Amino acid sequence: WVAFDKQVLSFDAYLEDEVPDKSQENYRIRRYKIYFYLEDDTVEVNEPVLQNSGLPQGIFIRRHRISLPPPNEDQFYTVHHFNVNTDIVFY
Amino acid sequence: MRECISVHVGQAGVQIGNACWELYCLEHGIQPDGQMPSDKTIGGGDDSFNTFFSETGAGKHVPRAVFVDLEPTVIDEVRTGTYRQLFHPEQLITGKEDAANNYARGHYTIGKELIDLVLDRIRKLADQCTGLQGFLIFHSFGGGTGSGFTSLLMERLSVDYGKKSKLEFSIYPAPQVSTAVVEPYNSILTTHTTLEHSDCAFMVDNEAIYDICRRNLDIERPTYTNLNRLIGQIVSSITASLRFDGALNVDLTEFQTNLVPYPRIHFPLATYAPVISAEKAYHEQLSVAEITNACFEPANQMVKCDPRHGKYMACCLLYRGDVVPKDVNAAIATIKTKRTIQFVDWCPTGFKVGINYQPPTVVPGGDLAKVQRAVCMLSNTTAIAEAWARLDHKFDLMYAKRAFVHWYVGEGMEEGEFSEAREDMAALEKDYEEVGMDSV
Amino acid sequence: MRECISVHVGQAGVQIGNACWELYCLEHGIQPDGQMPSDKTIGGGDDSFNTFFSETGAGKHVPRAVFVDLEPTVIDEVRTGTYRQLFHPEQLITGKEDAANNYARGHYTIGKELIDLVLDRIRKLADQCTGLQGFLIFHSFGGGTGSGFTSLLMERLSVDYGKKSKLEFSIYPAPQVSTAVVEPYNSILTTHTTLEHSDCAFMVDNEAIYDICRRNLDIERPTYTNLNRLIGQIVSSITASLRFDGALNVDLTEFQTNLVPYPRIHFPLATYAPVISAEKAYHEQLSVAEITNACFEPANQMVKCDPRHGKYMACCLLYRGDVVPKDVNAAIATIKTKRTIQFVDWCPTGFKVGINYQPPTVVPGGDLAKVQRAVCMLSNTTAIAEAWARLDHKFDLMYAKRAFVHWYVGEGMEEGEFSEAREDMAALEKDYEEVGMDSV
Amino acid sequence: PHYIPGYTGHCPLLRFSMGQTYGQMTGQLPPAHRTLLPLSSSMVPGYTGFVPQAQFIFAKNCSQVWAEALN
Amino acid sequence: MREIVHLQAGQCGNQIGAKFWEVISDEHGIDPTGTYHGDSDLQLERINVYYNEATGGKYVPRAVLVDLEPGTMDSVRSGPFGQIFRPDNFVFGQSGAGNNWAKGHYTEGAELVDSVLDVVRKEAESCDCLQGFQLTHSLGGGTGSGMGTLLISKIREEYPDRIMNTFSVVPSPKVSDTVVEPYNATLSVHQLVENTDETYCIDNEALYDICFRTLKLTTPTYGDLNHLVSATMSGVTTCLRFPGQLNADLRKLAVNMVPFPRLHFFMPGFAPLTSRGSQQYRALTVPELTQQMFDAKNMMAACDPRHGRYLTVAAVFRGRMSMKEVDEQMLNVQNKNSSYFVEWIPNNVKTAVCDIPPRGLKMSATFIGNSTAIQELFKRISEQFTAMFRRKAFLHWYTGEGMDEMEFTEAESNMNDLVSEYQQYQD
Amino acid sequence: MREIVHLQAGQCGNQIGAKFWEVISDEHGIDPTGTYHGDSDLQLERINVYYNEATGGKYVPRAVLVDLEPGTMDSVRSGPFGQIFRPDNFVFGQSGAGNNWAKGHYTEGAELVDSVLDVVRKEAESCDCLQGFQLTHSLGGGTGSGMGTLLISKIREEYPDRIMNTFSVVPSPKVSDTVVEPYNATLSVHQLVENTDETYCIDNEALYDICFRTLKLTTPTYGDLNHLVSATMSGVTTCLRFPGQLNADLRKLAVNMVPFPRLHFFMPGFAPLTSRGSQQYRALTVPELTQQMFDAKNMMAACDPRHGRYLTVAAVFRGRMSMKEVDEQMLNVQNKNSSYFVEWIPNNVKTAVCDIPPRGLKMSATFIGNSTAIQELFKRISEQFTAMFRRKAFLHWYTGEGMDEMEFTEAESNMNDLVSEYQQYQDATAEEEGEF
Ligand SMILES: Nc1nc2c(ncn2[C@@H]2O[C@H](COP(=O)(O)OP(=O)(O)OP(=O)(O)O)[C@@H](O)[C@H]2O)c(=O)[nH]1
Ligand SMILES: Nc1nc2c(ncn2[C@@H]2O[C@H](COP(=O)(O)OP(=O)(O)OP(=O)(O)O)[C@@H](O)[C@H]2O)c(=O)[nH]1
Ligand SMILES: Nc1nc2c(ncn2[C@@H]2O[C@H](COP(=O)(O)OP(=O)(O)O)[C@@H](O)[C@H]2O)c(=O)[nH]1
Ligand SMILES: Nc1nc2c(ncn2[C@@H]2O[C@H](COP(=O)(O)OP(=O)(O)O)[C@@H](O)[C@H]2O)c(=O)[nH]1
Ligand SMILES: [Mg+2]
Ligand SMILES: [Mg+2]
């Protein structure tokens, strides 16, 4: 935790969604910031602040260690499971 | 030969008649377009369609109805619906602009421009008629075109056609809720118009249908379509004895001579007893004795009232299906001995019974079930004074502060007819109570 | 023609009836979906289902039962279980909140919100009835709706149906094993109503069925399901002669006139002697003498009170199976030769005998065995007084510090009703004493 | 599939047409066109628990609203 | 077959009216070039109520765009649906309005009344059976209060028997745009109480407040406020445009809400209002919409209803819907709130149900309510008027065009009767 | 019909409640998004006790979350099962409390109250038949009941008319390390009794001992401490949610455990707690549950039961089971030590059998007990008001706000009489002659 004291791996992300009441949209694309922390193998995601449309924004998932998809859930997320243009499941 | 004219005036009446005429077509073999399929077995006579339908060569049968309104937006869905080719195009007459909850507008302002074309069409239907019994109008009781145009229609049809058994179906605003605030004004104003010209004006509530469907049908949050469907069955039951033969045929004139003891008490209550779901009809046994008894329960009345308070005056019961007369005579006798059901002391006979040989037709997509037996009872009781007194007070509580009066007196109508309709309502209540106490 | 409506009230009463109507449907040919199967027949028809089932036009048998209870998700077990289409959805009626082991809540606060609907369903079930023998209720003395709503039910059924053979089945609080702390309060309050509005109150304890399941049936860790099948076996034997012919057919009216001598003494002791597991049933012969002996054994009683501390008054023996009258008389004679079995001197006869030809029916998954012959014993001793003196000791121990009384007084009853309920219990012990001492 | 002669309202390009009947000048002239209009056995209706999408709909029985919700 | 001719005046009323023609167009499926491309024949069934046929399968709205300066007509024309308007209907003056009532009603209004009346009467004779009018304006500016009142006066003098309607933006207490704001309002509502017979009272801070803590938008522009007032603008007239199980035209609402010939000022509203984050958490049915009617959370006028009593209320519903579920629940909200509704009126509520819901919404409704809480608004601006009039603060602008001292106090004597009549029948 | 609304106050209500909602979501089968992915139907039959259906197959809880600091319930809304809560229920202030109780009652008197009451109103009324409410909070902080008797005195106006449970975290007996601390212990009480009367007092020191000696977890955080309470909250509501052979809702527990109306003391406990390395070597029988739930070790309140008498015992079990083993628990321990089961109550145990067990486990229980050894819990707080009350030295921070100090001195008078009322029914016997 001294060779990776303040080194964070950051990714862009988005989530697709289905809207019940289609008053302003048909499908939603919510931007996100996947942060991976090397000192503790810990994952944090964030939602950036957008224009006059606001959700409850800010932290989406706290800085904790999300395990895996429900197959073989005993292990945890490492640096090798993170890549660009891929699908990752956070809860 | 045993025919009737059914003019359905009002936005409520055209939608009551939409489900009333779908029951009539499916009761006979007539398709939604009017075609009459050959080599298909149905259960009428051979002149059974002749009560409600005319005969053309090509197999097309047209209903004996005139849909009357002042809003073009509720017949246009009929005029483009599944029943376009059913109705003759000149039957579906329309107005130009809404009557707008105004007795003073459908009776004095728009009605005069269109009542001339209404009665001329009723002449065109009655000329084709040869054995006519009466008139079956469908209307609401507190609207603009169901209460203003209806009065012009009945007053003019009474003087033109003389003495003819013109019975009436109305949707009464009794209970705690209503769809309008000016609606109690329309209620007592059309009561004067239906007091001397009507012959059997049957009242039906809205919350009463709500409670009997929520309980007996086990069905929650109703719309108006299934309310239309139940009224369609309770009129089809009434006119079934004209359309089909039975053990005890009861024509529409037989209703008149004993449902109306005095010429001001012509407001009978209705009730349909086997309002049973598609699951429960497979569970309960359906027999004559236990649905005749279940017809008199206050939780199944078609009017939100309390029949345990007032004492009954006359009851006619109409039976459809596998009904034998001894089972009714056992069912009537076990009801006369019940002490919770009270009659007036003067008439010991009390009951009229008619048995028809035709079980009712269930429509696809409906809520009722294929039952082999049905009971439709028309009760004249002392109880409806409750429904009338809390509408008269409901009017009077408005009339004291002159609310919603300038809309009525501003066109056609003068102010003095408000008090005249109120005192006639009091005279209607008083004469309805003076036939209540026991004679000595 | 002869028949009786069964009422099931409380979680106890509903769960008894589920393992009881399971027996009744299997005793006849009735499947869980109501209809008897076209292929395979269980026996002759005889219209023997009429005592408990009603026949419809489509060929469906419907139990004459109402499952009235304030607890929503024990009836919904029936509503989604195997016996789904057997019962009506409106025969099974639920409340919104429990009485929460409160007699006052089931009698006064929640009970009045549902007492009108259950009497309407009892009336409608009994309206199609012709020769109704009486009612059977099933409850427990410890619940809120099993004691409070039960008490209100007898209050209303006494005036609606008059003097009618209203049998009662109940579950006593055991001397030691008890699932509630307020249980002595509920039992002493519902007996205040049972003593005057129940024609016969069958008395059943949990600990004794626990004892005979581990000893006779040889099962370790018995559950409520096993106690449910033992009770339903007896209730079937109580109503055995109503459906199947026998050498001595004994009616429900013949029970009361031959069991209870005075209008407070209607608390018989229940005993089912040939309760035996399958691995030890077919090995030894089961003579009618040795099962009459097993009826008088202290541990085979279903209430925790041995008759050695009391004196028998009247014994009702109900034999089923291949039983001839002559060897019953030998079994009764050899009981009378014992001075340890004490009989009162004002009943020289002592015994009422009923023989039926239909052996008991085994349920799949049950723990009993198929026996050729069986017996149910309905004793009547003064030994039941010690089962109630313990309840008064349990009542007086916590009423004296007014424990849990504000959980009753706040919910619509006064504090003096507790002393009034102990009052009739303070007289009931002396009423059992005055019929015990010898006349000199 | 024509318009009935009593029909008032709006039909496109009626004002520029002439010499034909109301059922022929309309029939000669959108995909979603509806104007012309061209388990329940595993549960009893006394049930008071919960099923999703079962607190919404009429035109059919309670024992039928759990049919359309499930199916 | 009944129709409503549209009119709009002022700078805000032009933009509110323009946003209203956005809402009608996509609900009736007609593109920026006026050609139908939606998919329902219900959409063109009652298209003649607002639009006119044009040659080539072309639909043109029937609206008259009115102001004094040419700086708003080009802005509306440059908009996304500005093309569909008829250029001959673009009637306007040359000089500026000046934010003055006497400039837009007496001096520069007099050269446009000959133009606006002819173009209205051109559109009132090509139609079949006239029903009523629509006007969007405000009471805070000059041209919206001066010519937006003169237009009301001339039309009733020519069409007395047709039910007029005008949807006005009444002034705001704290959010103030002009310093002559209570001048223009009290003069305008002096006539609007006599010759309208139905009008809806719309504030601007309530629009700000419902857009901030109900809709949850951080920086609301004008356009979303225009869309929100256009949502309740179209829901009044939806019973004319699509069928139902009981319908209610503008004359039906007028007779059956307005109890007395003078009290016809109403509160608007719109039921399914929700943020983008709370859309998945709302069970969109009328048991939450009926509570959305009568709560002050969805009041588009900033006079809270709990300081008054409801005279009459209309709730116009749109969607495939149950009937008692409206009918019993609107009774239950009257029974649970007995002190918030007046006596001498048994049922205080109209229910109207339309078949077709808006685009993307399974179920909607619009609120229309008459309250005695309107007297809070008119007495407050009466107090704000007399704070400056006794000083004779800004009358030097108004008196130059031919207005004397007594024409102002006559308007206030004819305005303080409104708060007097509302208080008289509140208790 | 029967339904509960969860009010969470403080960090403590928010952090315990968030762990509670993820437990119930696992028990009913709800994913973190909010949809149903369960493997049974009884996991859905009574889900109208804690969740509302929103359009789109998205079940949403019925918790309103209350705190006076914005920061705390951003972690709740961004937790593992954190987006399930509807945003309008999340009702925040801008400034909370700190240091002084006297600040706490002379700070935000009525600002956040009416906002919460609106949310509590709409959520309760838009339903069928209210079983009641439940409230999670702790007795501590820079306000104690200072915000409390400020904010809730506006809510207690009509709230004691139906059921209202409260799982309250009582202060621990370790050290005084809040400097000017023993002023918030005295001003805490007031209405500490007559507005819930179903309080499940939960100590954190006892929470660690079950984690150290029973669960044998080497590093127990505050999170797994909140896992133990969440099982108990689920335990006292499982008969209402899942079907059972012997049903027992909240009222049936409340009626059958509260002889006198001033008994807000129910020390909790979860029976089948075993270490991970010892779970494999476990019998998990009906006696095995009973010997643990009645044990002094498995008591989530720092009061040894052998210091007083069990006034009444509840035994809400889960599984396919027996109850007669609990009868031997009196008959051995009661009739021999009559001071461990109150004798003027004949049978001191209510039992309940809910068929559906907790996840993973085959069998479980949930003990709550009204033992009269809880006299000592409001006695450690009693020597912790008297100790520093009389000096009033660092109370110059209090003094600046400084409300009426009769209210300082009447709160413990409404607490020591509660202790006396427990001392009575610990010493009161059947034949009321032999204790005078
Ligand atoms: N059963 C049934 N009743 C309806 C239907 N439509 C309207 N109603 C009844 O009509 C009442 C309101 O209609 P009214 O105001 O009387 O309408 P009207 O009599 O046609 O007169 P107008 O108001 O001018 O349209 C409601 O309370 C309904 O009970 C329907 O489709 N089915
Ligand atoms: N023999 C037998 N007894 C039962 C059974 N179920 C419950 N009991 C008895 O019922 C008592 C528990 O109280 P209940 O009468 O069931 O309470 P309830 O019927 O649910 O009524 P409420 O308290 O108002 O909800 C126990 O003491 C048992 O003796 C059963 O399945 N078989
Ligand atoms: N809904 C909506 N309201 C507006 C818009 N523009 C202005 N307003 C409101 O209208 C007021 C200003 O209009 P006003 O000065 O009366 O225009 P004028 O009459 O032409 O001078 C402001 O207080 C705004 O609240 C808009 O685009 N949409
Ligand atoms: N179990 C548990 N206890 C907590 C937590 N946070 C605080 N506490 C306890 O509560 C006490 C102080 O919390 P408090 O200040 O009252 O939180 P507040 O209610 O937001 O003011 C500490 O002694 C902790 O033991 C938590 O997340 N879990
Ligand atoms: Mg109409
Ligand atoms: Mg129960």
Side-chain angles (χ1 to χ4, degrees), chain B residues 142-399:
Chain B
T145 187
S147 158
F149 204 107
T150 301
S151 162
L152 289 176
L153 172 59
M154 293 180 183
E155 290 215 320
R156 186 82 32 73
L157 188 153
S158 184
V159 65
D160 291 331
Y161 280 135
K163 183 62 65 67
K164 194 151 280 312
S165 51
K166 67 189 48 55
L167 72 164
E168 180 183 0
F169 286 88
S170 76
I171 304 184
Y172 181 74
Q176 295 297 110
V177 70
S178 66
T179 56
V181 59
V182 71
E183 171 165 20
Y185 280 2
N186 304 57
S187 296
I188 70 163
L189 282 171
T190 191
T191 317
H192 199 174
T193 76
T194 196
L195 198 42
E196 68 267 10
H197 297 108
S198 160
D199 296 339
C200 289
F202 314 121
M203 295 296 172
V204 181
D205 202 310
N206 295 294
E207 294 180 355
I209 315 176
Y210 288 157
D211 287 3
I212 67 164
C213 82
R214 189 200 55 68
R215 174 181 321 91
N216 303 257
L217 275 298
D218 281 340
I219 192 168
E220 70 279 351
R221 64 172 71 71
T223 181
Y224 286 159
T225 62
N226 293 93
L227 267 57
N228 298 314
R229 205 162 320 250
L230 182 50
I231 302 307
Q233 292 269 11
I234 201 163
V235 184
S236 175
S237 84
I238 279 174
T239 61
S241 66
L242 317 162
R243 280 186 331 268
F244 309 113
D245 53 352
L248 277 179
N249 294 294
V250 174
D251 289 346
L252 194 143
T253 61
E254 265 86 352
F255 281 166
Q256 296 294 322
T257 184
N258 46 20
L259 269 298
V260 184
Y262 303 93
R264 207 177 286 273
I265 308 300
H266 53 77
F267 301 98
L269 282 79
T271 300
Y272 197 72
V275 293
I276 194 66
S277 177
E279 59 81 14
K280 314 221 192 83
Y282 169 101
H283 296 286
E284 182 65 26
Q285 65 182 357
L286 268 289
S287 77
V288 187
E290 51 89 22
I291 61 184
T292 306
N293 184 28
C295 183
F296 282 81
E297 62 196 330
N300 270 72
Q301 318 282 331
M302 282 325 317
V303 182
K304 180 60 70 180
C305 181
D306 193 21
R308 264 175 272 101
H309 287 174
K311 44 213 301 183
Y312 292 71
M313 293 177 70
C315 294
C316 78
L317 286 89
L318 281 81
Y319 292 76
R320 317 181 60 170
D322 189 358
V323 192
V324 293
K326 190 191 80 176
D327 293 348
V328 184
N329 264 347
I332 296 170
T334 193
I335 286 176
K336 303 202 71 43
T337 60
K338 293 182 183 293
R339 294 291 95 194
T340 186
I341 296 166
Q342 190 60 22
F343 280 14
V344 288
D345 62 358
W346 71 73
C347 56
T349 64
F351 303 82
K352 185 176 176 64
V353 58
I355 297 98
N356 189 359
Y357 285 155
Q358 203 74 180
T361 46
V362 65
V363 298
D367 293 330
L368 297 175
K370 180 187 188 308
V371 297
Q372 294 134 30
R373 194 163 301 107
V375 176
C376 168
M377 176 255 269
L378 283 72
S379 65
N380 196 357
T381 175
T382 304
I384 192 167
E386 287 177 354
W388 291 352
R390 62 187 284 267
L391 194 48
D392 293 15
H393 168 235
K394 186 182 286 185
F395 173 99
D396 189 359
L397 183 62
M398 284 193 109
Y399 195 12

Side-chain angles (χ1 to χ4, degrees), chain F residues 190-205:
Chain F
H190 317 292
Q191 61 84 31
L192 200 55
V193 181
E194 69 275 16
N195 295 114
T196 290
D197 275 314
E198 205 62 29
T199 310
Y200 312 92
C201 294
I202 289 167
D203 198 335
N204 285 346
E205 185 196 88

Side-chain angles (χ1 to χ4, degrees), chain E residues 189-190 193 262 409-418:
Chain E
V189 66
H190 161 236
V193 69
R262 224 161 181 261
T409 181
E410 192 192 7
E412 291 305 349
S413 66
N414 286 313
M415 171 145 168
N416 269 6
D417 48 5
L418 273 167

